[PDB]
Amino acid sequence: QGIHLSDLSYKHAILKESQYTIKRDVGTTTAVTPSSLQQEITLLCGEILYAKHADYKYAAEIGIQYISTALGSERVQQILRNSGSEVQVVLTRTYSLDIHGVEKSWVEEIDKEARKTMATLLKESSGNIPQNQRPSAPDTPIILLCVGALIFTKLASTIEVGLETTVRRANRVLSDALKRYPRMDIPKIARSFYDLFEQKVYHRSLFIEYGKALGSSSTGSKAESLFVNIFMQAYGAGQTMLRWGVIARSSNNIMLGHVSVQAELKQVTEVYDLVREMGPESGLLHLRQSPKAGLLSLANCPNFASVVLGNASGLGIIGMYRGRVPNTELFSAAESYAKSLKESNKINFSSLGLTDEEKEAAEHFL
Amino acid sequence: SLQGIHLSDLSYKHAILKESQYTIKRDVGTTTAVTPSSLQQEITLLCGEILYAKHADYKYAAEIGIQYISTALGSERVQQILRNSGSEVQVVLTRTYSQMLDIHGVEKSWVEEIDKEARKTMATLLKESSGNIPQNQRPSAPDTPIILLCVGALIFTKLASTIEVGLETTVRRANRVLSDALKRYPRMDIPKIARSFYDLFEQKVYHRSLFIEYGKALGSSSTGSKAESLFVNIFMQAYGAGQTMLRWGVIARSSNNIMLGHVSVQAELKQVTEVYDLVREMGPESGLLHLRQSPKAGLLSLANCPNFASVVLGNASGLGIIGMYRGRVPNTELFSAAESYAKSLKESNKINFSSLGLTDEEKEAAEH
Amino acid sequence: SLQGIHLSDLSYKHAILKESQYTIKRDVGTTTAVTPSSLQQEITLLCGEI
RNA sequence: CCCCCCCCCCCCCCCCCCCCCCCCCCCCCCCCCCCCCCCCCCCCCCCCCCCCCCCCCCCCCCCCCCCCCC
């Protein structure tokens, strides 16, 4: 019985022992906006949504600039330094907004194009444009960031896959925002955000800190309360396998009782126990693109993975999941049981805890 | 043996929204009116003037109500509340001119209109009354701001639905609730006043938690007014805001709906449990989360358990509670079944001599 | 199995009416009569007169 | 009242040890395969509802304890 190694725990324990700290992004510089310029960046965000622009390259950087004003004039540097990146910040100024890394030409284009659209429309509206339709509306940066939130959820897949999902969901979710700013190019804005999250990796954890911070506040906007709710659906990032694993247990799939699957029990247990060891940060590990992540891989248990996927297929959840199936045999079996389970209707009078005079009348149900 | 397959995801989801050491500074340039405690009598009169006469416009009616709350809570204590709500908005102390009130954001023209129109109505009526208008019918009565805020309290309850739905409910209930107030001020335009409050709660989101703090504060005091004790009681019926599903969930358990025993529903047990355990984790603030328009809210969604939701709604339909609830029904099959059982339960009369714990000489007579 | 489906709403409802760190200042201008302890015999006589 | 008898203690014998014996002493590197992880879907919310309302002063008896003997 003494033949036992708790390897996975030790594997994690070694990634804590590092007393030494990595200083990556040595020369790098990124734009930060002081809290004082929140109204100016709000207007710029609105301008992006308000008119149909030629280029949506820096759209995401503008969104990050609103986060910057919301979190702190200089509190942002602290977050970035603490994310592991030794990148330096650059406080954006005003001229007659000068955002670091953002072409002055682009800023002027966005402003010019928006003013042109405002003039055209105000002539038609007979001088009547309500507050809610103007680029000045305070919720415009939140709307911009909500497109970013949707691409944040699908950061686990292709740059492509994410755009589909973003567009589809944005139509239902940002329904009313689209009514007021029908000129918002969701695909180009969403592309700017994918490009940003991929290049400036530290902005992933800055976005997380905005989410965390926003989630805490007493009073949120209708737009703000949406943002966090998109951010939440992003929690089980890259861990879809572990969550479908609990679903297989809940379904009581008889294939989880297979001798070859039973053999992998200790490895499976080790992974779920590492999640508890890591606590709340465990979920967003894959989302942060953390090197630590991947310890939560179910590679060590291929037969279990096969059953979990089979069960998901049988229940009709699997959808477009590309996850490789090691044991095709076990998969098919788990799928068959789950399909039979799916259709079958049964009653646990054990669970309900009724009187045997209420349980008497329940039998009478034809 | 296969028990260690468990993730407490919902708890972690909440735990992440506590880890935020960093604080958001929204509403950077914003300014709102505050009235010092000293001007409580002047704002009381203005509140009464709104109710007393039939006015042309009831735009700032809600802001006037907030101004009474301001006097009641604190000359400058209000800034603290607003700053602590997450909004970095600045306050502006309302002054006096000639005697009138200069409220920040409120058009001087509007203040004068409300006053002028009320004086005109007082003059018309005093001629009819033969110079006799009792204290209780004058805009000067001290309970007039509370009456104004009670219309706001009714729209506060229906902040969970349409701007429209709320007005129906507000009007209906106001007739029964503010029965006697309406007798003294029959000129109070409940729909316009209630509209001003919806507009205010939607625009100045920080005033939602200011209203909550007035409610919390009022709820604490030793002696309240008859009007004040009504306000809190409207505010209480507002506690289960947006969580109607969880409360109907306990009703389904209390009804012992056999559909809660369905295999597909049994499968969702752990998710359902996780949501009710998050309520306990969040404690008393859990209920008013949706009311505050808090981004944190929505973690209390029963989206993760569609089959359970179907049964809960079915049970509500069968018992005849469901009313005008637009809540989507994922499993139509389960819903119909739960509904049938609940309808049969509704009519059936049975006695648990097990629960009562009587002597079998009292249980003897009960059979008779 | 079906345990855990419970909300202690009424307790929370009360708990919220304790959290009020802020205090209400109603009856801002109001004035009421108080009699000093020294005049207890005089007020006693007046009570008797009624 | 209590108390009230009787009453020193001890007293023999007797050195201990004495054999035998160092321990240890063989063999023996370890290592050696495979293997990135991910991939679906999903805004939430939506009903109803002021509570309170009856009746009702309590109290009301009796009773020092102690008291022998030694």
Distance linking N and C termini of chain A: 54 Å
Quick one: overall form of chain A?
globular
Number of strands of chain A: 2
Widest beta sheet: strand line-up of chain A: 1-2
Number of helices of chain A: 18
H/E series of chain A, N to C? HEHHHEHHHHHHHHHHHHHH
Nearest-angstrom radius of gyration of chain A? 26 Å
- What fraction strand of chain A? under 5%
Strand-pairing-aware structural class of chain A: mainly alpha
The largest inter-chain interface, given as chain pair and residues per side, is: A-B, 73 and 61 residues
Please give the share of residues in helix of chain A: 55-70%
| Assembly status | part of a larger assembly
Let me know the largest β-sheet of chain A: 2 strands, parallel
GO cellular component, one term (chain B): ribonucleoprotein complex
Subcellular location (chain B): Host cytoplasm; Virion
Main location (chain B): host cell
Keywords (chain B): Capsid protein, Helical capsid protein, Host cytoplasm, Ribonucleoprotein, RNA-binding, Viral nucleoprotein, Virion
